[PDB]
Amino acid sequence: LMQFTLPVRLCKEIELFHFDIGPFENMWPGIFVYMVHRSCGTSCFELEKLCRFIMSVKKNYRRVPYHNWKHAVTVAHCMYAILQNNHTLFTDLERKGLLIACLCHDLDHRGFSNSYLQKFDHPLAALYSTSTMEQHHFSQTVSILQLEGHNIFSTLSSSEYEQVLEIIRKAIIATDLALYFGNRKQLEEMYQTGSLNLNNQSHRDRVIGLMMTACDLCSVTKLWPVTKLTANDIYAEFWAEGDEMKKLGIQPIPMMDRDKKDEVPQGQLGFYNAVAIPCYTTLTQILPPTEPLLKACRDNLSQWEKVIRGEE
Ligand SMILES: Cc1nc2cc(C(F)(F)F)c(CCc3nc(N4CCCC4)nn3C)nn2c1C
Ligand SMILES: [Mg+2]
Ligand SMILES: [Zn+2]
Secondary structure (H helix, E strand, C coil): CCCCCCCHHHHHHCCCCCCCCCCCHHHHHHHHHHHHHHHCCCCCCCHHHHHHHHHHHHHCCCCCCCCCHHHHHHHHHHHHHHHHHCHHHCCHHHHHHHHHHHHHCCCCCCCCCHHHHHHHCCHHHHHCCCCHHHHHHHHHHHHHHCCCCCCCCCCCCHHHHHHHHHHHHHHHHCCCHHHHHHHHHHHHHHHHCCCCCCCCHHHHHHHHHHHHHHHHCHHHHCCHHHHHHHHHHHHHHHHHHHHHHHHCCCCCCHHHCHHHHHHHHHHHHHHHHHHHHHHHHHHHHHCHHHHHHHHHHHHHHHHHHHHHCCCC
């Protein structure tokens, strides 16, 4: 059969948590197929259907600075690296579902937060009152799965099919950072009082939600230059949202106000202490081989500290 293979530097570095998928857009599909084949098998999906699904997914990501096709493939690579470092902890269905979930998790993102859609009074905010974009992203995922020739799950039973779509739904809802805080507190408490039980489906669900937050944030776990240049894309979106808030007559919060450019180093520190470090710490407690994500995060935190001390 037809194995996908990568040039040697990519074949070695793609196994590491800090791998950057590179600026060559045309290689990103092959990089994803490579990762499905190794984390799932050459048997998981019909090659033709999978290729047709990947290209329709790509086409439904928009040309925004951050929440774009490159982000989708980046989040999927982090998941690949978690799965490959925790071989025997996951079901066959989870292996199938989570890479697809990660590829799909920001489908048809417009570069605006749930908060901005609610203030603009966008139709999606009446259709979905919480996790607005995330319920959209899962809805776009089902759309694409139902196009002709796009059912990559066509070999599962009705109940295996329903279970995979349920893993994907919860994984995508979990990328709503508003939900992350409470999910990580519960996991922290369950880990610390020894109640954490991976045979309990509601426990697995929480663990997969935390993996989703971890993959979604993995830009803070790259080499410093990748971390820093990504943060420019992230802010380019947030600042355009801030401009849109000012057009609605609403002073945006400082994170979104390009006039507060200077405070970015300190906003990144708060973010690493409040979200990132706690995320990768609890993840490392539950899945010890994901520790390189925590260690990279802590290295980037110390790089933002140097930026504030004027040494960078
Ligand atoms: C991968 C990645 N993911 C996220 C998510 C976010 C957030 F969720 F906070 F929006 C942030 C922004 C963090 C931030 N900046 C600021 N301001 C900057 C100047 C004034 C205050 N406040 N805060 C909390 N960065 N970020 C990155 C780099
Ligand atoms: Mg999202
Ligand atoms: Zn995302």
